[model samples]
Target: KVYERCEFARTLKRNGMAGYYGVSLADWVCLAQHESNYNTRATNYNRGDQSTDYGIFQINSRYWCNDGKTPRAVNACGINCSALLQDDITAAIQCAKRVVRDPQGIRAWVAWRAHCQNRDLSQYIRNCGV
Candidate 1:
């Protein structure tokens, strides 16, 4: 399912991502916006490593989840890549939490560095009423 901007922020806030791992709700919303444009069925093929990025967060199969075809990848989130594509974003949220448990924090998503960091991200959740 694709989501509206505010709807996406509200949903992530409700799922306990308001400030997860020091990444604020706006950060999450912006990350997902660029990652998948809030489309749950989004997938990006990584031709370099041959691993696929799955779902709204565009989670990589290289180290976070297993897509069963990434060759020697580590399923650090201990989840199936398919789970990230589900309309229910709970799995995607959990996996993202796991990703931030690392030292990279929100920088784990390359898009965040370019689009979410050191910016006025407050507008991302401005009218979300969260």
Candidate 2:
């Protein structure tokens, strides 16, 4: 699903992404925009890690989901990587929640650090009525 901006904020908020682990809704929106461009089914392959990142949140196969291929994968979310690609985003959000519980918090997503960290992201959720 190519989620528009407002719906994206509301969806993340509805799933309790507002400051979940101190990562605000704007933070989440910024991360999503950078990682997947608000594309629910977006995916990326990490050739070095030999794993795939799935869905809008770009949850990784190495630590969060099992694709039956990634080396030494932990499957912390205990789900198949396929689940993260659903347009609904519920499962993807669950795994993302678990990821934030880690010591890295939202830093687990490298894209956030590269593009959103310490950045003025107020506009990501502007006028969303969130």
Candidate 3:
């Protein structure tokens, strides 16, 4: 049903939207489900102040997709979200890498460890040098 949507969201991830969103991979999959039901060609009736946009990432027609043509032009291709598509899944993954660079940030490791939790991941972080 939403194969293309999944592709588009994954593509946004590739283009670096992931850093901005800051959810884990499984979480992203969950987000995609909520956002558009993973509909690549979906549009919103009212995008609040934002213009009605189309496509999987649901990029706004007015601001995001415009390369200086009409809304249709933006809609015709990935226009706004094209860079996302061009990069692919690795681009999205890189976003996650940026957010929690150590994989075990304070929450993921140290804080948890102080309370005595997350042993496996903390061990991994410690073994990162090893």
Candidate 4:
């Protein structure tokens, strides 16, 4: 789904993710912007490893979600990656939570590491009041 930054933040807040999961709303917004530009249908095929990254959070098919196209995927999230490409983000958020709980924390997302981490991301939520 395409979302305005504030709209996305509000959704995240409504999901009780405002300040939880070791990631602030601003950081989450930043990560989403860089990862998928708020497009739910986003998908990336990694030719190097032949793995796919899916949805806003770019959950990886090799370890987190299954794409059926990838052979012998670990599917650690135990869900189909396509589920994340829908307008409703509830399932995607749940899967993302599991990914964060892994040893990498929010750093599991390269966008978060390169852009959101150790940065002042208040601009992302500036006047949204989310």
Candidate 5:
């Protein structure tokens, strides 16, 4: 069952992400379900020891989840002052929003189709601009 997490809604709203993305809350839910299943401490062992990804966003523990000399960063996601903190998450969300806005989902689909069809970009008119 999907847990009703107000933090998710509040984070999305305060970040002004609702007006963008064109991705519905259901989409977000689906994503989260696949990613973390609402488990804050989730981790994945995709390719054995070489790939031990972690956290809600499945951020690879390598770059994102660490700091200088493996000391751990302060404001990175899932960290002490990271996007898990309501105020700091806005920047991350906004960046994601820009990705959503770019290619405008439809063009994103077209890109996917072209990739699947093994066609060149010249065949598709890029509909949305970043």
Candidate 6:
């Protein structure tokens, strides 16, 4: 499923994500943009580790979600990775909150680290009224 960027931002803000779990709304928007372009069905396979990153937040099967097709999955979130690929992002948000609680915080997302960290991301939500 596809989501408009502004719509995602408003929903995120209403969910108290401005600073919830140590990630700001700007960070969330920026990360989601670079990670999945707000596409809920986005998925990527990593040939190097033979693991896949799933959904908007790109939760990894190696540590966060279960990939039933592979025994290498650690499934720390105790959730099926496919759950992240749906239009309803409730489950994904829950998992991401857990991910941020990790010591890495928002740094767990490479997209945030590479494109958002230490940068002014206000532009992402400049006039969206979020």
Residues 4-83, candidate 3: write the lDDT tens digits.
33453455445555334444333343344333434344566344644564433333455444444453333322344443
TM-score for all models, in order of appearance: 0.87, 0.84, 0.35, 0.88, 0.41, 0.87
Cα RMSD for candidates in order: 1.8, 2.1, 11.3, 1.7, 10.2, 1.9
lDDT of 1 by residue, 1-130 (tens): 7775687788777776776657778887888887885567788878687677787877777788886765688888988888887778888778788777878677777778888876898887897677
Better of 4 and 6 by TM-score: 4
lDDT of 6 by residue, 4-41 (tens): 56776887877777556457788888877777755687
lDDT against the true structure, per candidate, is 0.78, 0.75, 0.38, 0.78, 0.39, 0.76
Tens-place lDDT per residue, model 4, 1-130, is 7765787788889898867846888888887777775557778878588678787777778789786776788888888787888888887788878778778787777667778776788877888875
Candidate 5 wrongly placed segments (more than 4 Å):
1-6, 37-39, 45-49, 61-130
Error of 6 at 122 (Å): 0.6
C-alpha lDDT of residue 21 in model 4: 45
lDDT of 5 by residue, 15-116 (tens): 555334455443443333344534355556444533345544344444343323344333233343234223344433543343344444423334333442
**Ten-residue stretch with the least lDDT total in model 5:** 121-130
Give residue 119's error in model 4 in angstroms.
4.0
The model with the greatest TM-score is 4
Error of model 4, residue 14, in angstroms: 0.7
**TM-score of candidate 2 to 2 decimals:** 0.84
Which residues of candidate 1, in runs, are more than 4 Å off?
none
- In candidate 2 the C-alpha lDDT for residue 128 amounts to 81
**lDDT for predicted candidate 6 compared with the true structure:** 0.76
Query: CA shift at 104, candidate 1, in angstroms?
Result: 2.4
